[PDB]
Design a protein around this ligand. Structure first.
Ligand code: GTP
Ligand code: MG
Ligand code: MG
Ligand code: MG
Ligand code: MG
Ligand code: MG
Ligand code: MG
Ligand code: MG
Ligand code: MG
Ligand code: ZN
Lengths: 140, 43, 422, 157, 23, 37, 118, 80, 205
RNA sequence: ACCUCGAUGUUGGAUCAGGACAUCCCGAUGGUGCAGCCGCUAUUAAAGGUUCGUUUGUUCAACGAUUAAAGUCCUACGUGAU
RNA sequence: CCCAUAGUAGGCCUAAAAGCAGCCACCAAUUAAGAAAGCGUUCAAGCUCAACACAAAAAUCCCAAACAUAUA
């Protein structure tokens, strides 16, 4: 079956959040965290990365990874560590439309995440909605 | 079984009475006579 | 019903009745609180009067009785008189009523009236009906005088029983019916308890004097919002269970209970045994103490006596965890006795320490063992342990594909586990 | 008994007769009347534009696939210029006669999904369909020329 | 306009969910 | 089976059937939903 | 043929014949079907008894009445017979009894779809 | 159940039954029930041939059979 | 203050003079609070009866709990209990004077609105609990919108116009035909046979 | 306050019990917070049964020992020309 | 009746609370799907839904007999 996780690249630590759920379906947690750390080395370090692991009935691994999250990515772009509490009136950072475009350039490129809409509008609108939901204002 | 408390036709709990087609026709006939009476008194 | 009341406090100064733990001012304050709770009327006047001999047809010596008669009959605003005594005999009630031209109420009648007024659930209504049966039997004379109509010993026909005697017979049958109904209620409440007993939910019965903040403490512990503490007395009039989590991630049912007052007939509170038996079937008892109240020691005595009369198991009486509420009102309060937790329900000050202490008490009292157990992942044992016991820490051994889980588990669950997953 | 009673008071028999006689009689209508005698145009323009633009058209029954399987097939098709389209049959039916597609009527029934393009990657598309032994290629009409599956295979080869 | 009908559908779903909250 | 003057389907699986002259709510997933008119 | 009487409606199951033996607990209430299965003449006998006038001639009239469950009748009674009264209810015909001519005469009221499994 | 094959001529009419049968049998739920069970939706009157795990064949000629009837027969033969 | 206001058991200044039970205040059609005001929905009383503080509490609690305060508002269309009802001591023989004031009620006549609701909502969102309250009310009652109320009034008018019966209670009573005024009441000349005690027969034309 | 005051004798108990079922037990069945044992609840069932004692005039209640159970009622609070 | 991918485990909060413990926001991608209306999970997972597509019961024993169709 498909197991979805938001493991943080550097934090491949087996156990508390992954150990039980991963084991329940039958896994080699050592192998999983080793491969995840390989992916972490391939990519930047210290950032959440959604995963799409598929525990085959043959008891084997196919780790599929893509871009970092949208929430943490936007918070990093806006220079925020913790998101707004209200998120409708509270704002902790501002991002320009040009910056949004630039980040979107490297967003709609992940197979599992389904963001393959050719139009730039389709993806820019979604990220704008994500920012509006978060404590980020859309400049100009 | 099937008692009407007290006396039939007077108390709070009276024996039900139902109008037959015969009674309805009789009343309608009398009403028609009185309507004709109204007409003949209107002139 | 909109009855301005004159409070009469007999102060016993020598011999029996000379309380050494409370003062007439405090007792008058408590009685005023009782009437204000009863709501709709207030103490128009207050009179504390000495009484060397508290047991008489006229509770006061002839001189003081005449003095009170003059004052009461000269004050027209007074509509009723509340005599701060446990219970007054029918002769005393009749004589005082005739002398003072008003209606006389004792603490028993006042508490009974507030119960009848603010009782909602049918169980509460039935229990207060049982509690009223004594007051009824006392008051048949006055109540059925007008029905009696001054006819006696001259009618030669019918049931030989006099009017009064056959009224006694009717009240006997009424009480029998009430007791049968309460027995049925007890059976139904046992049915209700069955499921939680089988699931082995730790249960903590919160008891204490009235207006100690029992309901407020339960609200603070559980985190609920529908729980509504009140300023009035005898607010919580139904026994209900509320789930709350402890620091050990264990769910516990706090059982709210009726409040206890001093100087009341035992039968009043004991008539609620049908619903207070949940305390008897409890696992721990938490006694709340309004330490701010001047009469804390007298309230302690009253509640302990009430529990002993309710016949809770002696092991349960022992290990009663004591919490001193309302500490904020007493700034810089220093608990003296050991194994006592100072807390402030409204301000939520010592609630964490209280939670930890009662968690330890529950572990001791429920036969639950905190132990580390090694289980195999993917074998459903981990999920079973989550569902049938409170797991505290899961340390996963990836090399063996297993995990050591620190679990607080009861013996029944431990046996089921060892059999299900050898 | 008071005039106003908690129960429906018994009427005097003459009042009862009056009430019965003065009941509402509905009009009988002789012969029963029962047995006597934006987005749509948006997608109209969409279909017209699709038909005009695409040089080759095919149809299929991509309804048995998972969401992810359909998404993967869509991605494989977008790898080529071919575009997959979904439209309701309820409004697709008029378009055949509107655009003079008589032979296309007995082809769009039930779930139907279009595969409109100008450059046929039909060879690789059939290769992709082969590893999924279902979802048959359904008859289409390239450049106003109806092609059966054998015609599509010949054109592919 | 596609977006008009999209917003209409979203609002209709909201209305149905609000009505079903009690059901 | 509980006797009710008004019959209500208490879940998706409850179904109404008129048998032996009266209505019944039958349910297989939640038999406690069984009602008799 | 009193055994072959026919009740309209559900009277076979709803009509109840009540009697009391006189002894305590001797109240017997038997449905029409049960009474018919027990006695194949009781239904008609009771109907006639109820319809007859409630006087002392009723039992003599019932003596004059003769009831037989089936087609068989005693020879002496048959020789006594004078006239046969028309049956009050005309028995409706069954489909098996309807002639092909009548079936053809009655028109077909609708064209069933050709592709219907029926 | 081992294999299922559905043949029909869409340009020829009277194919709705078999087309709906195909759309139902190929449904991801059905195929996932037995991934081993293999469907071959060939196409070229319309017919359905089902070979079961026990080497037993069912032939449903869906020229005048409704999809419900075809599916009911298919399920009955699955139950065997 | 959108939520329904609390209603006191008895008037703050209690009445001192016992007054007769003029049942005419329940009898007949309602002439007040018959139309909507600052609202689109209501509970219509299809019969006459007395509302107690218990009924008021039922209405208030049910409506307050089931409404949406941020999108719905409710308002009483009936005054708080004012008419005093007196009860004698249990088991008292007849005579000896009128009993002491026991409770207070508010009369309601057929055709009156008891509670009225409004706000950013449609009928279906409210009709549920309004019908609950109406069914629990002491008289026949129905949750009615402005549209439904107008529809029922127009339907009554249409039935009155198109009824095929040559004879109507109104006509017979007014003309005293058959001398039925010996059996009827003077109120019947205006009730037209649609009202019988506290009960309103709506199907009656 | 409608019959009975030119009498319709009255509470408990004995005797014999007739009846209702809104069933205490025995039978059949659905649900259950029905694991089993006890149970609770509801539908159907009135053929049969439904204890003996200590005080108390008691019907009742309390208590003792049992029972499958020690049912709720009506019968002029059944029955004193027994 | 069919069907359900997904910006993403929206933020905050908490050990965790991912549509669903609580608060704020409630945009947005796909042809079409609530930052979710209900179950469910410790949390996840999974199941749906909104979406595309095609009336009665009491005590001696029920209580006329029966009857749907021959012209007001
Ligand atoms: N716990 C607590 N209660 C306080 C304090 N100061 C005032 N109170 C009041 O104490 C009252 C306690 O009300 P409850 O908690 O309902 O009382 P209870 O102990 O449950 O007793 P009952 O009223 O008989 O149910 C409330 O009116 C509080 O406002 C304080 O420091 N602590
Ligand atoms: Mg009589
Ligand atoms: Mg309280
Ligand atoms: Mg008299
Ligand atoms: Mg008189
Ligand atoms: Mg005589
Ligand atoms: Mg029964
Ligand atoms: Mg009596
Ligand atoms: Mg759906
Ligand atoms: Zn169900």
């Amino acid at each position: 079956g498909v197991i979805r996780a938001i493991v943080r690249a550097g934090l491949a630590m087996p156990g508390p959040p992954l150990g039980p759920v991963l084991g329940q379906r039958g896994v080699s947690i050592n192998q999983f965290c080793k491969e995840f750390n390989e992916r972490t080395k391939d990519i930047k370090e210290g950032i959440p990365l959604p995963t799409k692991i598929l525990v085959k009935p043959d008891r084997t691994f196919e780790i599929k990874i893509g871009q970092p999250t949208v929430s943490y990515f936007l918070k990093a772009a806006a220079g925020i560590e913790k998101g707004a509490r209200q998120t409708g009136k509270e704002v902790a950072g501002l991002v320009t439309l040009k910056h949004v475009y630039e980040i979107a350039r490297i967003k709609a490129q992940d197979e599992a995440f389904a963001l393959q809409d050719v139009p730039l509008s389709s993806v820019v609108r979604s990220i704008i909605g994500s920012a509006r939901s978060l404590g980020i204002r859309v400049v100009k | 079984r099937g008692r009407i408390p007290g006396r039939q036709w007077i108390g709070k709990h009276r024996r039900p009475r139902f109008v037959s087609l015969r009674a309805k026709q009789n009343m309608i006939r009398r009403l028609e006579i009185e309507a004709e009476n109204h007409y003949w008194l209107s002139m | 019903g909109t009855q301005r009341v004159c409070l009469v406090h007999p102060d016993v100064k020598w011999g029996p009745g000379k309380s050494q733990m409370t003062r007439a001012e405090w007792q008058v304050a408590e009685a005023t609180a009782l009437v204000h709770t009863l709501d709709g009327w207030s103490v128009v006047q207050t009179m504390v009067v000495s009484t060397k001999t508290p047991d008489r047809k006229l509770i006061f010596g002839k001189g003081n009785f005449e003095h009170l008669t003059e004052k009461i009959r000269g004050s027209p605003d007074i509509t009723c008189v509340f005599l701060n005594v446990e219970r007054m005999a029918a002769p005393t009630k009749k004589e005082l009523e005739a002398a003072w031209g008003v209606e006389v109420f004792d603490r028993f009648t006042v508490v009974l009236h507030i119960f009848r007024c603010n009782a909602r659930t049918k169980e509460a209504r039935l229990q207060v009906a049982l509690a009223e049966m004594p007051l009824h039997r006392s008051n048949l004379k006055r109540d059925v005088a007008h029905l009696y109509r001054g006819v006696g010993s001259r009618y030669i026909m019918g049931s030989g029983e006099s009017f009064m005697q056959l009224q006694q017979r009717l009240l006997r049958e009424k009480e029998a019916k009430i007791r049968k109904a309460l027995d049925r209620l007890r059976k139904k409440r046992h049915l209700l308890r069955r499921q939680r007993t089988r699931r082995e939910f730790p249960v903590i019965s919160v008891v204490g004097y009235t207006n100690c903040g029992k309901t407020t403490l339960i609200k603070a512990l559980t985190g609920d919002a529908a729980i509504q503490p009140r300023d009035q007395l005898f607010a919580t009039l139904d026994v209900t269970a509320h789930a709350g989590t402890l620091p050990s991630r264990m769910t516990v049912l706090y059982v709210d209970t009726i409040g206890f007052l001093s100087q009341l007939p035992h039968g009043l509170i004991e008539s609620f045994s049908a619903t207070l038996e949940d305390v008897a079937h409890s696992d721990l008892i938490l006694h709340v103490r309004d330490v701010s109240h001047p009469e804390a020691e007298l309230q302690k005595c009253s509640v302990l006596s009430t529990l002993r009369g309710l016949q809770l198991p002696a092991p349960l009486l022992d290990s009663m965890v004591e919490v001193h509420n309302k500490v904020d009102l007493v700034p810089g309060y220093s608990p003296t006795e050991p194994n006592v937790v100072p807390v402030s329900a409204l301000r939520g000050h010592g609630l964490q320490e209280l939670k930890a202490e009662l968690d330890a008490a529950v572990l001791k009292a429920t036969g639950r063992q905190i132990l580390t157990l090694r289980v195999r992942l993917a074998g459903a044992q981990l999920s079973w342990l989550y569902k049938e016991a409170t797991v505290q820490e899961v340390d996963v051994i990836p090399e063996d594909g297993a995990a050591d889980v620190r679990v607080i588990i009861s013996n029944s669950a431990y046996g089921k586990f060892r059999k299900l997953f050898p | 008994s008071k005039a106003v009673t908690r129960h429906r008071r018994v009427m005097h028999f003459q009042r009862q007769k009056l009430m019965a006689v003065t009941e509402y009689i509905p009009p009988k209508p002789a012969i029963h009347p029962s047995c006597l005698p934006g987005l749509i145009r948006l997608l109209r323009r969409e279909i017209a534009a699709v038909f005009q633009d695409n040089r080759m058209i095919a149809v299929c029954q991509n309804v048995a696939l998972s969401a992810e399987d359909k998404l993967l097939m869509r991605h494989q098709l977008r790898k080529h210029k071919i575009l997959m389209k979904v439209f309701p049959n309820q409004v697709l039916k008029p378009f055949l006669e509107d655009s003079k597609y008589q032979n296309l009527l007995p082809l769009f029934v039930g779930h139907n999904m279009l595969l409109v393009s100008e450059e046929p990657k039909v060879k690789e598309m059939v290769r992709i369909l082969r590893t999924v032994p279902f979802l048959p290629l359904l008859g289409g009409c390239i450049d106003d020329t109806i092609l059966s599956r054998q015609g599509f295979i010949n054109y592919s080869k | 306009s596609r977006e008009y009908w999209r917003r209409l559908r979203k609002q209709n779903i909201w209305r149905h969910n609000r009505l079903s909250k009690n059901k | 089976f509980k006797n009710k003057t008004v019959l209500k389907k208490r879940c998706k699986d409850c179904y109404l059937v008129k048998r032996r002259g009266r209505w019944y709510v039958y349910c297989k997933t939640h038999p406690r939903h069984k009602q008799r008119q | 043929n009193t055994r072959h009487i026919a009740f309209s409606g559900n009277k076979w199951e709803q009509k109840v014949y009540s009697s009391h033996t006189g002894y305590p607990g001797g109240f017997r209430q038997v449905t029409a079907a049960q009474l018919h299965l027990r006695d194949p003449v009781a239904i008609v006998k009771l109907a006639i008894y109820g319809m007859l006038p409630k006087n002392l001639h009723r039992r003599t009239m019932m003596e004059r009445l003769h009831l037989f469950p089936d087609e068989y009748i005693p020879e002496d009674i048959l020789k006594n017979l004078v006239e046969e009264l028309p049956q009050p209810r005309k028995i409706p015909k069954r489909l098996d009894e309807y002639t092909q001519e009548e079936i053809d005469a009655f028109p077909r009221l609708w064209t069933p779809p050709e592709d219907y499994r029926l | 159940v081992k294999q299922v094959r559905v043949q029909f001529c869409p340009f020829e009419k009277n194919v709705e039954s078999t087309r709906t049968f195909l759309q139902t049998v190929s449904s991801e739920k059905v195929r996932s029930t037995n991934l081993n069970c293999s469907v071959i939706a060939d196409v070229r009157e319309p017919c359905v041939d089902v070979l079961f795990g026990d080497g037993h064949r069912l032939i449903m000629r869906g020229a005048h059979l409704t999809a419900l009837e075809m599916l009911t027969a298919f399920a009955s033969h699955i139950r065997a | 203050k959108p939520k329904l206001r609390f209603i006191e058991r008895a008037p703050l200044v209690p009445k001192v003079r016992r007054e007769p039970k003029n049942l005419s205040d329940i009898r007949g059609p309602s002439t007040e609070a018959t139309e909507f005001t600052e609202g689109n929905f209501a509970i219509l009383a299809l019969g006459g009866g007395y509302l107690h503080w218990g009924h008021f509490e039922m209405m208030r609690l049910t409506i307050n709990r089931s409404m949406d305060p941020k999108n719905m508002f409710a308002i009483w269309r009936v005054p708080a209990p004012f008419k005093p009802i007196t009860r004698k001591s249990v088991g008292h023989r007849m005579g000896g004077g009128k009993g002491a004031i026991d409770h207070y009620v508010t009369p309601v006549k057929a055709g009156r609105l008891v509670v009225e609701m409004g706000g950013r909502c449609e009928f279906e969102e409210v009709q549920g609990f309004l019908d609950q309250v109406a069914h629990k009310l002491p008289f026949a009652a129905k949750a009615v919108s402005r549209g439904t109320l107008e529809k029922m009034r127009k339907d009554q008018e249409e039935r009155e116009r198109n009824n095929q019966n040559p004879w109507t209670f109104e006509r017979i009573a007014t003309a005293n035909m058959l001398g039925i005024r010996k059996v009827l009441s003077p109120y019947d000349l205006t009730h037209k046979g649609k009202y019988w005690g506290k009960f309103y027969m709506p199907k009656r034309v």
